[PDB]
Design a protein around this ligand. Structure first.
Ligand code: CL
Length: 214
């Protein structure tokens, strides 16, 4: 619990499981202080990482599909599965999902009816974003691991990387993948130490400082 102690990623992945004391399976997060000034247009860090191990309910997925592809989406573990008939539910205000994926053959209606609704919300299935294809099961599994990140005005950033229930090797894998993605997103122009400090923590537990290069 010593605030000065820097743990390796492997040590942290084992520790966080012992620091998760809530009456529910807590989310594990990585928090970093970045060496950037987010008040500069040329120094924001925003993007996604695809984690090697998907995050279950952390990313609620609606799949819109037809025929055999519906059963494929269900089997892949999409939280909601429907055909074009789900369009009216969304028109009515239903927005309880974190991502939408679809097969090419429903996009006529999805694009025309839900373009102006899901589009601005960054939730419209998009070939360009890898969220429209006939490989709906693969898309679903990938999207369950696709985590968005965005620095706040202080230059701090964070992301969920698992649950306290995860095996430690899976937490470690996801922790490193997230850090690698931050480094991949360093602004060209930022000059000082990029990863100023990095922590692993749970929703309601202590923070454990880590060496992000371990
Ligand atoms: Cl394909």
């Amino acid at each position: 619990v010593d605030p000065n102690k820097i743990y390796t990623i492997d040590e942290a992945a084992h520790l966080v499981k012992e620091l998760a004391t809530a009456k529910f399976d807590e989310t594990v997060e990585v928090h970093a202080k970045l060496g950037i000034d987010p008040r500069r247009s040329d120094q924001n860090v925003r993007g996604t990482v695809s984690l090697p191990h998907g995050l279950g309910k952390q990313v609620r997925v609606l799949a819109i599909a037809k025929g055999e592809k519906i059963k494929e989406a269900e089997e892949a573990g999409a939280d909601y599965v429907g055909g074009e008939e789900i369009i009216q539910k969304i028109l009515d205000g239903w927005m309880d999902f974190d991502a939408v994926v679809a097969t090419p053959d429903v996009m006529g209606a999805v694009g025309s009816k839900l373009g102006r609704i899901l589009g601005p919300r960054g939730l419209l299935p998009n070939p360009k974003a890898g969220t429209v294809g006939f490989n709906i099961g693969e898309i679903i599994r990938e999207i369950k691991g696709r985590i968005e990140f965005r620095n706040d005005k202080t230059g701090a950033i964070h992301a969920p990387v698992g649950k306290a229930s995860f095996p430690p090797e899976k937490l470690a894998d996801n922790i490193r993948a997230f850090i690698r993605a931050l480094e991949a997103h360093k602004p060209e122009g930022a000059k000082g130490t990029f990863l100023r400090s990095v922590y692993v923590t749970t929703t309601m537990g202590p923070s454990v400082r880590i060496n992000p290069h371990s």
